[PDB]
Write an enzyme that holds these catalytic residues in place. Sequence first.
Site, PDB file in Angstrom:
ATOM      1  CG  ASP A 288      -1.929   0.991   1.278  1.00  0.00           C
ATOM      2  OD1 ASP A 288      -1.874   1.885   0.399  1.00  0.00           O
ATOM      3  OD2 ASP A 288      -2.807   0.948   2.160  1.00  0.00           O
ATOM      4  CB  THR A 289       2.196   3.335  -2.799  1.00  0.00           C
ATOM      5  OG1 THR A 289       0.989   3.502  -3.545  1.00  0.00           O
ATOM      6  CG2 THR A 289       3.012   2.188  -3.428  1.00  0.00           C
ATOM      7  N   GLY A 290      -0.141   4.175  -0.476  1.00  0.00           N
ATOM      8  CA  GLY A 290      -0.856   5.256   0.195  1.00  0.00           C
ATOM      9  C   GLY A 290      -0.791   5.198   1.679  1.00  0.00           C
TER      10      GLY A 290
HETATM   11  C1  017 Z   1      -6.711   1.059   3.941  1.00  0.00           C
HETATM   12  C2  017 Z   1      -6.786   0.597   2.507  1.00  0.00           C
HETATM   13  C3  017 Z   1      -7.106  -0.876   2.388  1.00  0.00           C
HETATM   14  C4  017 Z   1      -7.795   1.435   1.704  1.00  0.00           C
HETATM   15  N1  017 Z   1      -7.389   2.874   1.696  1.00  0.00           N
HETATM   16  C5  017 Z   1      -6.220   3.298   0.832  1.00  0.00           C
HETATM   17  C6  017 Z   1      -5.019   3.576   1.818  1.00  0.00           C
HETATM   18  O1  017 Z   1      -3.883   3.603   0.972  1.00  0.00           O
HETATM   19  C7  017 Z   1      -5.089   4.877   2.664  1.00  0.00           C
HETATM   20  C8  017 Z   1      -5.063   6.209   1.857  1.00  0.00           C
HETATM   21  C9  017 Z   1      -5.171   7.439   2.752  1.00  0.00           C
HETATM   22  C10 017 Z   1      -4.057   8.253   2.945  1.00  0.00           C
HETATM   23  C11 017 Z   1      -4.187   9.350   3.807  1.00  0.00           C
HETATM   24  C12 017 Z   1      -5.371   9.600   4.497  1.00  0.00           C
HETATM   25  C13 017 Z   1      -6.466   8.749   4.311  1.00  0.00           C
HETATM   26  C14 017 Z   1      -6.362   7.646   3.472  1.00  0.00           C
HETATM   27  N2  017 Z   1      -3.965   4.892   3.580  1.00  0.00           N
HETATM   28  C15 017 Z   1      -4.193   4.655   4.894  1.00  0.00           C
HETATM   29  O2  017 Z   1      -5.296   4.457   5.493  1.00  0.00           O
HETATM   30  O3  017 Z   1      -2.966   4.626   5.576  1.00  0.00           O
HETATM   31  C16 017 Z   1      -2.994   4.743   7.038  1.00  0.00           C
HETATM   32  C17 017 Z   1      -1.757   4.008   7.558  1.00  0.00           C
HETATM   33  O4  017 Z   1      -0.638   4.891   7.307  1.00  0.00           O
HETATM   34  C18 017 Z   1      -1.205   6.202   7.377  1.00  0.00           C
HETATM   35  O5  017 Z   1      -0.723   7.007   6.305  1.00  0.00           O
HETATM   36  C19 017 Z   1      -1.900   7.416   5.577  1.00  0.00           C
HETATM   37  C20 017 Z   1      -3.087   7.347   6.573  1.00  0.00           C
HETATM   38  C21 017 Z   1      -2.669   6.195   7.429  1.00  0.00           C
HETATM   39  S1  017 Z   1      -8.703   4.050   1.713  1.00  0.00           S
HETATM   40  O6  017 Z   1      -8.107   5.452   1.723  1.00  0.00           O
HETATM   41  O7  017 Z   1      -9.578   3.646   2.924  1.00  0.00           O
HETATM   42  C22 017 Z   1      -9.764   3.891   0.233  1.00  0.00           C
HETATM   43  C23 017 Z   1     -10.591   2.758   0.156  1.00  0.00           C
HETATM   44  C24 017 Z   1     -11.260   2.545  -1.078  1.00  0.00           C
HETATM   45  C25 017 Z   1     -11.029   3.413  -2.174  1.00  0.00           C
HETATM   46  N3  017 Z   1     -11.653   3.160  -3.367  1.00  0.00           N
HETATM   47  C26 017 Z   1     -10.124   4.466  -2.068  1.00  0.00           C
HETATM   48  C27 017 Z   1      -9.436   4.681  -0.877  1.00  0.00           C
END
Ligand code: 017
Lengths: 99, 99
Positions: free
Chosen positions: B25-27
């Site tokens: 998960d690059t996000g």
């Molecule tokens: C948790 C995943 C299975 C799904 N997520 C994408 C995810 O990459 C999010 C994307 C993201 C990024 C920032 C803020 C909210 C969501 N990152 C995230 O929740 O990471 C958390 C852990 O490390 C932290 O750094 C980022 C927030 C924390 S998500 O944002 O809930 C989402 C779910 C479904 C869709 N279609 C689009 C996005």
Amino acid sequence: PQITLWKRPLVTIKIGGQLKEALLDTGADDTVIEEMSLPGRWKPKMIGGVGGFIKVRQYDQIIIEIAGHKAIGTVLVGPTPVNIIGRNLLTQIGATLNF
Amino acid sequence: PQITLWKRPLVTIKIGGQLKEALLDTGADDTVIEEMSLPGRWKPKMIGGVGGFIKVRQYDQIIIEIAGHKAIGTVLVGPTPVNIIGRNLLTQIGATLNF
Ligand SMILES: CC(C)CN(C[C@@H](O)[C@H](Cc1ccccc1)NC(=O)O[C@H]1CO[C@H]2OCC[C@H]21)S(=O)(=O)c1ccc(N)cc1
Ligand SMILES: [Cl-]
Ligand SMILES: [Cl-]
Ligand code: NA
């Protein structure tokens, strides 16, 4: 490009003539952007992440430039904390994960 | 390997003696795993995503094997709906996004 992950993989996107910053997110099935006006009709959708679910507006067949690459596809709009480019549009710009 | 993004980029990890499936998960800034025991000290943390925040336990200096590649770093443990490998460990296995 080859993007490393020491910082967030943020790129410029262009949608509706406006530049925005968004995260290239391989963990997102779906592209989701913060509140904005888009053309046409929308359909309901729920998306679920680490803290639970949110309701979003699903717009189909939206023109969007991502890091200079053209895509046309589904954009969800709702109270996401950051703009996210998910796999539906990462595949359109030819992105892969490599190690 | 080169991993396309037509489907979720799931891999097998080994952590705490256990084999699990996890999402590359690059996000995600941070790696977050479903509830399990890990040895050593921890401190509480709140992490936020789509949907809001969850409380997690932060364990430092944990070794994980990710699709055959060893890495060490911080692992967050809590009620995430999916096991996620975040950038803090993706960097260590030399993962990049390419397009
Ligand atoms: C948790 C995943 C299975 C799904 N997520 C994408 C995810 O990459 C999010 C994307 C993201 C990024 C920032 C803020 C909210 C969501 N990152 C995230 O929740 O990471 C958390 C852990 O490390 C932290 O750094 C980022 C927030 C924390 S998500 O944002 O809930 C989402 C779910 C479904 C869709 N279609 C689009 C996005
Ligand atoms: Cl770390
Ligand atoms: Cl590097
Ligand atoms: Na530790």
